[model samples]
Target: ESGALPKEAVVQIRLTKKGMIEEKKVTVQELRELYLSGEYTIEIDTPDGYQTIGKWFDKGVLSMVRVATATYETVCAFNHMIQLADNTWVQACELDVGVDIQTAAGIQPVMLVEDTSDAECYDFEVMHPNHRYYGDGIVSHASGK
Candidate 1:
């Protein structure tokens, strides 16, 4: 299994613009570098069927907005995920920003879930060893997994 999967893979981020979807493929390393350098805005469609809009900052901090809100004030805290032993992954869900009211409108922030188990997990810290200095950045979700 280890040989089959590469140590790193590129994930594509797609967004709807002008009634059409535009995509940009980025490696995990590139995302981390970009996030650490400065603020960035990445828009992606989540596996749960909602558009995820992310705002990243220099200190490994991020804010996410869902389709339910138009303002940045109603955003969710940044989060990350990492794979653990025995093929189990942990997601480190950050909630420092607290729950935004807009998230209550059935469009909560996008979170990392197991590809197989489909369980909500938080282990962002575990997945990327360099998270202390730079975050894992953005991970992409393909259509229909």
Candidate 2:
């Protein structure tokens, strides 16, 4: 375990673009995947939901805001994702940030993060292992604005 913390915590974040929170459950998996296997975990549910997050002085919290979208579109908006050396393909989710977040209505910065299970249960024929990072859009989202 990470020690001095639970395996998971009561995550409080937002969702922002193609998809909206409406009513959702967001949290962080601190330990991610595990040792020798990735060492972290990230998750997502909807799409293009660019969330503006912040770790406030009040809460002073840190968690991931994994939005549903593509890195190609996100980086221009916000970014992060990966493919393991062992051929583990994964996609990214928006990492929302906040500071003293109380009103829950304000501009939040986005930092995308992806974990072991963060990737899709899919495949493709590509040369990523013997190369650099491999990956692949967005709108109506206040991404890092």
Candidate 3:
């Protein structure tokens, strides 16, 4: 929707406040181990300029975007299926954030630019108002318009 108000979104794994015991942050090695061991959960968080788009946890596929409402979640234990060398090299790369699925976790952060142009704002009058379209309905229509 063009006129929709920008909102924030967040997806985060529910970890104990104490956090994980592993000294180092989640690494490719760790992820591989987890994947090989069986199933696991990956938390996602999107705050502002983005929405849940799609996900495939069972297949270990995830994708997210900004300025759009598309987020995804998936779980897969096929680490050995996709590799680019000994798992260590790939695992090290996963630690940083980027467009890579393994590292991005499908959540891409985005910032929305405010529209201040006169054309961006609109004023309308209801010549023949109907009770069927008011309040929540009206707000929804206006927001989506």
lDDT of 2 by residue, 19-52 (tens): 5333334322321222114322222221223222
Return the TM-score for candidate 2, rounded to 2 decimals.
0.18
| lDDT of candidate model 2 versus the reference | 0.23
Residue runs of model 2 more than 4 Å from their true location after superposition: 1-7, 30-51, 54-145
Give the candidate order by descending lDDT. 1, 2, 3
Candidate 2: Cα lDDT at 118: 22
lDDT at residue 98 of model 3 (Cα atoms) = 33
User: Which model is ahead, 1 or 3, in terms of TM-score?
Assistant: 1
Clashes in candidate 1: how many?
11
Q: Indicate which candidate wins on TM-score.
A: 1
**Candidate 1 lDDT over residue span 18-57, tens digit each:** 5765567555445445445544443432333323433332
Model 2 CA lDDT for position 17:
34
lDDT of each: 0.29, 0.23, 0.21
